[PDB]
Design a protein around this motif. Structure first.
Motif, PDB file in Angstrom:
ATOM      1  N   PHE A 195      41.553  36.115  32.631  1.00 58.39           N
ATOM      2  CA  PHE A 195      42.634  36.690  33.432  1.00 58.39           C
ATOM      3  C   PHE A 195      42.167  37.936  34.197  1.00 58.39           C
ATOM      4  O   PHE A 195      42.380  38.040  35.400  1.00 58.39           O
ATOM      5  CB  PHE A 195      43.825  37.010  32.503  1.00 58.39           C
ATOM      6  N   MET A 211      48.690  27.117  32.327  1.00 63.45           N
ATOM      7  CA  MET A 211      48.303  28.531  32.260  1.00 63.45           C
ATOM      8  C   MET A 211      49.125  29.331  31.247  1.00 63.45           C
ATOM      9  O   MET A 211      48.646  30.331  30.725  1.00 63.45           O
ATOM     10  CB  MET A 211      48.403  29.187  33.643  1.00 63.45           C
ATOM     11  N   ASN A 212      50.336  28.874  30.944  1.00 63.33           N
ATOM     12  CA  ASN A 212      51.173  29.530  29.939  1.00 63.33           C
ATOM     13  C   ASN A 212      51.053  28.921  28.542  1.00 63.33           C
ATOM     14  O   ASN A 212      51.729  29.345  27.610  1.00 63.33           O
ATOM     15  CB  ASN A 212      52.636  29.517  30.370  1.00 63.33           C
ATOM     16  N   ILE A 251      44.082  27.289  40.302  1.00 62.74           N
ATOM     17  CA  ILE A 251      45.081  28.034  41.062  1.00 62.74           C
ATOM     18  C   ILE A 251      45.038  27.676  42.548  1.00 62.74           C
ATOM     19  O   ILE A 251      46.073  27.655  43.210  1.00 62.74           O
ATOM     20  CB  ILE A 251      44.901  29.555  40.859  1.00 62.74           C
ATOM     21  N   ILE A 277      40.170  37.064  37.377  1.00 67.83           N
ATOM     22  CA  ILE A 277      40.791  36.276  38.438  1.00 67.83           C
ATOM     23  C   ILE A 277      41.210  37.220  39.565  1.00 67.83           C
ATOM     24  O   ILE A 277      41.842  38.248  39.303  1.00 67.83           O
ATOM     25  CB  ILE A 277      42.007  35.488  37.909  1.00 67.83           C
ATOM     26  N   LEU A 284      49.903  32.623  41.110  1.00 63.28           N
ATOM     27  CA  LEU A 284      50.295  32.057  39.832  1.00 63.28           C
ATOM     28  C   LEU A 284      51.607  32.669  39.348  1.00 63.28           C
ATOM     29  O   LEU A 284      52.511  31.956  38.895  1.00 63.28           O
ATOM     30  CB  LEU A 284      49.182  32.251  38.795  1.00 63.28           C
ATOM     31  N   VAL A 325      45.431  28.844  26.598  1.00 64.96           N
ATOM     32  CA  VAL A 325      44.964  29.447  27.846  1.00 64.96           C
ATOM     33  C   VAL A 325      45.516  30.851  28.063  1.00 64.96           C
ATOM     34  O   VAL A 325      44.773  31.746  28.449  1.00 64.96           O
ATOM     35  CB  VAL A 325      45.318  28.563  29.065  1.00 64.96           C
ATOM     36  N   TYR A 326      46.807  31.039  27.800  1.00 63.90           N
ATOM     37  CA  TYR A 326      47.499  32.294  28.078  1.00 63.90           C
ATOM     38  C   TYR A 326      46.770  33.511  27.500  1.00 63.90           C
ATOM     39  O   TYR A 326      46.734  34.573  28.112  1.00 63.90           O
ATOM     40  CB  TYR A 326      48.928  32.247  27.521  1.00 63.90           C
ATOM     41  N   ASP A 371      42.545  36.749  27.900  1.00 64.86           N
ATOM     42  CA  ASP A 371      42.600  38.003  28.659  1.00 64.86           C
ATOM     43  C   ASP A 371      41.371  38.329  29.498  1.00 64.86           C
ATOM     44  O   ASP A 371      41.495  38.876  30.589  1.00 64.86           O
ATOM     45  CB  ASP A 371      42.855  39.153  27.694  1.00 64.86           C
TER      46      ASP A 371
HETATM   47  F1  LIG Z   1      42.964  32.978  33.523  1.00 67.36           F
HETATM   48  C1  LIG Z   1      44.014  33.337  32.861  1.00 67.36           C
HETATM   49  C2  LIG Z   1      44.017  33.377  31.509  1.00 67.36           C
HETATM   50  C3  LIG Z   1      45.138  33.776  30.837  1.00 67.36           C
HETATM   51  C4  LIG Z   1      46.256  34.097  31.541  1.00 67.36           C
HETATM   52  N1  LIG Z   1      47.386  34.491  30.875  1.00 67.36           N
HETATM   53  C5  LIG Z   1      48.426  35.192  31.457  1.00 67.36           C
HETATM   54  C6  LIG Z   1      48.575  36.511  31.215  1.00 67.36           C
HETATM   55  C7  LIG Z   1      49.612  37.228  31.750  1.00 67.36           C
HETATM   56  N2  LIG Z   1      50.484  36.604  32.555  1.00 67.36           N
HETATM   57  C8  LIG Z   1      50.350  35.279  32.809  1.00 67.36           C
HETATM   58  C9  LIG Z   1      51.249  34.631  33.623  1.00 67.36           C
HETATM   59  C10 LIG Z   1      51.099  33.281  33.868  1.00 67.36           C
HETATM   60 CL1  LIG Z   1      52.209  32.465  34.878  1.00 67.36          CL
HETATM   61  C11 LIG Z   1      50.068  32.578  33.303  1.00 67.36           C
HETATM   62  C12 LIG Z   1      49.191  33.232  32.493  1.00 67.36           C
HETATM   63  C13 LIG Z   1      49.313  34.564  32.258  1.00 67.36           C
HETATM   64  C14 LIG Z   1      49.751  38.690  31.470  1.00 67.36           C
HETATM   65  C15 LIG Z   1      49.235  39.033  30.098  1.00 67.36           C
HETATM   66  C16 LIG Z   1      47.792  38.616  30.001  1.00 67.36           C
HETATM   67  C17 LIG Z   1      47.556  37.155  30.311  1.00 67.36           C
HETATM   68  C18 LIG Z   1      46.242  34.028  32.903  1.00 67.36           C
HETATM   69  C19 LIG Z   1      45.114  33.658  33.549  1.00 67.36           C
HETATM   70 CL2  LIG Z   1      45.041  33.571  35.236  1.00 67.36          CL
END
Ligand SMILES: Fc1ccc(Nc2c3c(nc4cc(Cl)ccc24)CCCC3)cc1Cl
Ligand SMILES: Nc1nc2c(ncn2[C@@H]2O[C@H](COP(=O)(O)OP(=O)(O)NP(=O)(O)O)[C@@H](O)[C@H]2O)c(=O)[nH]1
Ligand SMILES: [Mg+2]
Lengths: 468, 167, 166
Positions: free
Chosen positions: A312, A300-301, A278, A315, A323, A305-306, A309
């Protein structure tokens, strides 16, 4: 108004009619026309429109072969002069020199402008669309012959110039404005390429060197790789090699970020990895490297990775915001991205994907010809739309970055190969399985994993330093 | 106001995929398009009496950006999985697209339709019975469309909206 | 973003194209390839406002002199360029100024007087002389080098400012 040669001896003097040309509703905008009418207007005596020349030369191959275009503009160049008028005739009959007022006017206001504009088409053709000639040596021979045999003192300067330009092109430096900032180093020291990695290189210098690389890849893409949607067709590797190299870099970097994250099994270390990514995003944003920004956002999406939780959660909220703002650029069909691109001060690296989609859809969603009064007219407005997109692409390709190349870091990222010898599906399945391993689905509890990094995880941050 | 559905078009590139959404959004009586303007991917429609707003994401042309697929797919509630009926490879790709959608949405039951698209007059290589069997094996509707005549286009999108409504 | 139509005019060989390409690409063109008519675009932030510049690069060779009216009609602002080592090119300025006024039928046309090639020592047009002319026109005078970039942004962006307040 000047009289013209008869349409029987010079085809480009046919009157405009809706059977051969249609205008959009201080120069006219052409909606459609015959090739003859398009070429007349390409080289019109009344006005200049160099942008028309770029539009035409970028897009014409969908309605006219290169060999045929050359024949047509040579035909356009060869304009018959009028015979002496009655006043001239009477003067000559009395042994006087005729005023030849009408002949002189026609030479000055019709012939010389049209011929100069034909020569300007040849010039632009050779300078900016030389691939027609690279791919067809005989076309080039015809051009050299034509230019090389134009006579007359009026065209001489440009004929000799264009001859030299062609010869130069056959065998084929930046100034700033301030010096580039000093290269930044972190754990890996200069020359120690074996130690280079996501966390050991300086995040500032990672972003810079990737921006230089991604800028060069962006700047290398030619309109020939785009018109006719050729990057989507069977021979895309032949016709669009620079575009595809650029996209594959983007894809590999995105996959590398995902790999760095899910192969870091320890939660604390993985948080450091994500946080460093980031930070690199933040520097991409500062450098207006939008391709780099979306590389990170895509990672990240991604599925692997997304769903992490627990990562996330840890962070810092200020990085969550960075982000999320980056991601919002892409929302609603890139609404905020498009506004941002149009507002910044270049140099920048656009996201190419939007251009590809708009070029493809423009080409697929509009007819090649318009039918009017029993005639088929070339749909030029379709070509103008495509050329507006390639023109915007070219506009952002002009401005260079004031950043110093670091040869070893450049090579490290040029050789990045996160998939190794694995095919895409199996590597992709691998990443998602790693994700499942390090953060199991609910209601499986979170396991612990040992640390893998033997060096400090603390980031040096993204604000540049400056010794005397 | 009205319900808005986020629809996403996925499938192999280079085989006329984009014609589907263009034919839908397009002004049905003038063959014209400018993808550059907003309202080029939004469309108010009435389906089974109920007015709704369609938001269509079709990133046709961006297929080589394969690492962006997850991010594009994430935005959608329903999916059109498109293959060309004269391109067997595009048909063989469908399984991976569906798997990828399921993973991104974290669900075994994502609203989707299978679409076989006729993009030219070349010989068909995927029989409709083949595609029907595949759709049945997935438990989803199959719609065949033409890229030239607008046949089946409305059926493809309206059927997907019904799949969402009945999810 | 607002779009600005800039037109670069002046005698053959004074460096109209070199100035334009230095601005667009940060590259000095060493070759002398006489222009017929070239067009360039540049997105740039000036005084905190994002501008789109369309720059028309024109022919200085006398053989093209009958085709000037045509581009003067479209231009919103003009760079009138001479070379400080070429007295004749300075004397040619006056004719460009008058034709522009004639064509646009106005005494109030955004213009900048540009003395190019200021990197060369062998000057023949003195700054005071060009400055006196600029004052009589009511326009700024900027010396430039397409080779070193000295004054190049100043010349173009000053013209943008004049169009802006026009
Ligand atoms: F380290 C991480 C691991 C997973 C995530 N996943 C995301 C999440 C959410 N929003 C997001 C938005 C973006 Cl742009 C990208 C990812 C995300 C909200 C719902 C829970 C997860 C994000 C980070 Cl910084
Ligand atoms: N030393 C120096 N040479 C320059 C400068 N600007 C242009 N030149 C040189 O002068 C020559 C003419 O430049 P050019 O830009 O082609 O002039 P032009 O006004 O566009 N000519 P034309 O009217 O025919 O298009 C070239 O050889 C170029 O390298 C400058 O600032 N310094
Ligand atoms: Mg020039």
């Amino acid at each position: 108004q000047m009289r013209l040669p008869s349409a029987d001896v010079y085809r480009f003097a046919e009157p405009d009619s809706e059977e051969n040309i249609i205008f959009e509703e201080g120069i006219p905008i052409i909606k459609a026309g015959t090739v003859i009418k398009l070429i007349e207007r390409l080289t019109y005596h009344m006005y200049a429109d160099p942008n028309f020349v770029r539009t035409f030369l970028t897009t014409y191959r969908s309605f006219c072969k290169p060999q045929e275009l050359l024949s047509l503009i040579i035909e356009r160049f060869e304009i018959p002069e009028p015979e002496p008028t009655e006043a001239d005739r009477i003067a000559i009959e009395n042994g006087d020199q005729p005023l030849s007022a009408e002949l002189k006017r026609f030479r000055k206001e019709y012939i010389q402008p049209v011929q100069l504009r034909v020569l300007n088409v040849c010039r632009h053709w050779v300078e900016h669309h030389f691939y027609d000639f690279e791919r067809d040596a005989y076309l080039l021979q015809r051009m050299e012959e034509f230019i090389g045999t134009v006579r007359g003192k009026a065209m001489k300067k440009w004929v000799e110039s264009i001859t030299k330009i062609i010869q130069r092109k056959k065998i084929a430096n930046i100034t700033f404005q301030s010096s580039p900032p000093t290269v930044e180093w972190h754990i890996s020291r200069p020359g120690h390429i074996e130690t280079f990695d996501l966390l050991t290189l300086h995040p500032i210098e990672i972003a810079r060197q990737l921006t230089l690389l991604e800028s060069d890849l962006y700047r290398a893409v030619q309109p020939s790789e785009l018109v006719g949607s050729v990057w989507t067709k069977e021979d895309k590797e032949i016709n669009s090699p620079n575009l595809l190299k650029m996209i594959r870099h983007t894809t590999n970097l995105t996959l590398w970020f995902e790999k760095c994250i899910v192969e870091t099994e320890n939660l604390e270390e993985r948080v450091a990895v994500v946080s460093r990514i980031i930070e690199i995003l933040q520097v991409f944003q500062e450098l207006n490297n939008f391709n780099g920004v979306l590389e990170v956002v895509s990672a990240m999406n991604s599925s692997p990775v997304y769903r992490l939780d627990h990562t996330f959660e840890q962070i810092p909220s200020r990085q969550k915001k960075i982000l999320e703002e980056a991601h919002e650029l892409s929302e609603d069909h890139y609404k905020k991205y498009l506004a941002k691109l149009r507002s910044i001060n270049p140099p920048c690296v656009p996201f190419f994907g939007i251009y590809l989609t708009n070029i493809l859809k423009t080409e697929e969603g509009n007819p090649e010809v318009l039918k009017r009064h029993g005639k088929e007219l070339i749909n030029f407005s379709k070509r103008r739309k495509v050329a507006e997109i390639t023109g915007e692409i070219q506009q952002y390709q002009n401005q260079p970055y004031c950043l110093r190349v670091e040869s070893d870091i450049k090579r490290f990222f040029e050789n990045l190969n996160p998939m190794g010898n694995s095919m895409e599906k199996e590597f992709t399945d691998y990443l998602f399985n790693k994700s499942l391993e390090i953060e199991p689905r609910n209601p499986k509890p979170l396991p612990r994993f040992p640390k893998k990094y033997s060096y400090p995880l603390k980031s040096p941050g993204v604000r540049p330093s400056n010794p005397r | 106001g009205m319900t808005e559905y986020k629809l996403v078009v996925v499938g192999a590139g280079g085989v006329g995929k984009s014609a589907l959404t263009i034919q839908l959004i397009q002004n049905h009586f003038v063959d014209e398009y400018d993808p550059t303007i907003e309202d080029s991917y939004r469309k108010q429609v009435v389906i089974d009496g109920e007015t709704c707003l369609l938001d269509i994401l079709d990133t046709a042309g961006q297929e080589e950006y394969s690492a962006m697929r997850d991010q594009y797919m994430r935005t959608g509630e329903g999916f059109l999985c498109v293959f060309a009926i004269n391109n067997t490879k595009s048909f063989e790709d469908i399984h991976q697209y569906r798997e990828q959608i399921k993973r991104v949405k974290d669900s075994d039951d994502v609203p989707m339709v299978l679409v076989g698209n006729k993009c030219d007059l070349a010989a068909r290589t995927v029989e409709s019975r083949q595609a029907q069997d595949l759709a049945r094996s997935y438990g989803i509707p199959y719609i065949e469309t033409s890229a030239k005549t607008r046949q089946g286009v409305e059926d493809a999108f309206y059927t997907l909206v019904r799949e969402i409504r009945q999810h």
